[model samples]
Target: ENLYFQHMKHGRVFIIKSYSEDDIHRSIKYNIWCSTEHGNKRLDAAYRSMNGKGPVYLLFSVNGSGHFCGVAEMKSAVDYNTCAGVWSQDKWKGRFDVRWIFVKDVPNSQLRHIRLENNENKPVTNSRDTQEVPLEKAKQVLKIIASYKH
Candidate 1:
């Protein structure tokens, strides 16, 4: 079956940076990941910021490097019990899990082309996890990813 992506050609692109190599591998191997309360909120804010249009390009980074580990396609929405410590303290902690597929491997050089100058830092703050990637830069990214298919 063919995959259905939200923003493949025209929608906004997103970057998801993992804290460590293990985390990056976990996400790709399991096709899933967790987000903190604030992090989950940030995703919602991004969706809103884009006026409901979904992210077409989703890239992953590891260890705060300005390099992409891989590209992914969203498979499902945020859901409960998908990750550890979700909805803690009964406060809607805004925690959730995202289902995705790792499509291709991206090197640091190519990864930097899609990231913004201010985004080349560790995700110490909530705002650092997800960021928009430029469309022009994404074209090259997509080309690299497509090469992996054949």
Candidate 2:
């Protein structure tokens, strides 16, 4: 499905054609490493191990480019609960232009961020392009997903 997204400063409306758990995980790992690095060995190990039982929830909103791609909202739960991620009842409620995707590898822990990839081949799920400059930053990797028309 295609969607229209709200344009932000220094960015454009990009449609999120699809959601990928692997990509999100990879992006998240990268961010964690970049921020903390080897100093936080414990955290590094924790994130690396999240792949065993993530099933973590991610939210995506629609954009005006007729593509339903945008940033993935990190709906943090008290204890990794799906219902906890709902924006309608949580701290950031009323933001309904979003959808959820689950990363089975993620564990029930405090998630920092995720990633969003271009819907090209769709095979490279959990990967990001370091060489390419994305619409937004990596912390909120999936924020500037992409805008594609149907």
Candidate 3:
């Protein structure tokens, strides 16, 4: 309730999981993901609404244990090809929209308290990825992020 309403006035926060430390490092300037393979419905809506909206933060998690390995601001959004090959043919290509965010690592101690578990009811189960974190929970993280000047 509070978190939902607050986000209407303030901005929003998104949790990004999957990919290894190496992948994240490689895509620091080119963060992208297929919308269908991203987060839950709420998360998709948030990103869709962000087309001309304000800034939103993406908290990256490595092991899905709620721990955010890093944080970043979404810079822009666009579409790309997953490049699916059908028996080495060009008929299996799929277009996927992705977001471009400039990520920065958050010191371990700083964001240890801000986690996905604290934001959502359950972890990624069958078909869910991101979580709609409460404002207070996000605020806790923003406090640390602000101190670091990111």
Candidate 4:
């Protein structure tokens, strides 16, 4: 069987074990963090989100225990850009959308903490989520993946 391994286009992923009473800050900018992969730790950036829904999907490395971290703003988009188009206006109806940039390192603290740490922080889960595709495909998939309030 042919399997395509992840190329880690922007950065790599790692486990961010939660620490005791440790809070991890978050942001939405291109960042650099430490990684434990092969002990080849270095700072790099990845994708991010700050929609007030939860912690960004990206992670970064920490230098030491109990170190302070924060979110870096990537780009700001209006919640509703009516002028963009009917579809764009529909999604932006009443909410702002932001894309986050993360670091390559995994924080030494717990992901739960990092997600819920600062003002930009939100409680994101590790649960499996389906891929989001074009508007047309969404109609077919929505049937299988019913919308649920968290």
Question: Which structure among the candidates has the greatest TM-score?
Answer: 1
Each model's TM-score? 0.57, 0.20, 0.55, 0.19
Alpha-carbon local distance difference test for all models: 0.52, 0.27, 0.49, 0.25
Best by lDDT: 1
Clashing residue pairs, backbone N/CA/C < 3 A, model 3: none
**Candidate 2: lDDT over CA atoms?**
0.27
Q: What value does the lDDT take at residue 56 in candidate 4?
A: 23
What candidate 3 gets wrong by more than 4 Å, as runs, is 1-9, 29-42, 64-67, 77-80, 84-109, 112-128, 148-150
Q: Which prediction has more favorable TM-score, 2 or 4?
A: 2
Question: For model 4, where is the 10-residue window of minimal lDDT?
Answer: 124-133
- Candidate 4 versus the native: TM-score? 0.19
Tens-digit per-residue lDDT, 1-150, candidate 2: 123332333322122222343333433343211111221232234334444343222322221222222233222222222233232123321211122332222211212233344533232123322112234433233322332212
lDDT of 4 at 106: 28
What 10-residue stretch in candidate 3 is worst by lDDT?
86-95
How far out, in Å, is residue 117 in model 2? 16
- In candidate 1, which residue ranges exceed 4 Å CA deviation? 1-9, 45-55, 64-66, 80-104, 113-127, 148-150
* lDDT comparison, 1 vs 2, better candidate: 1
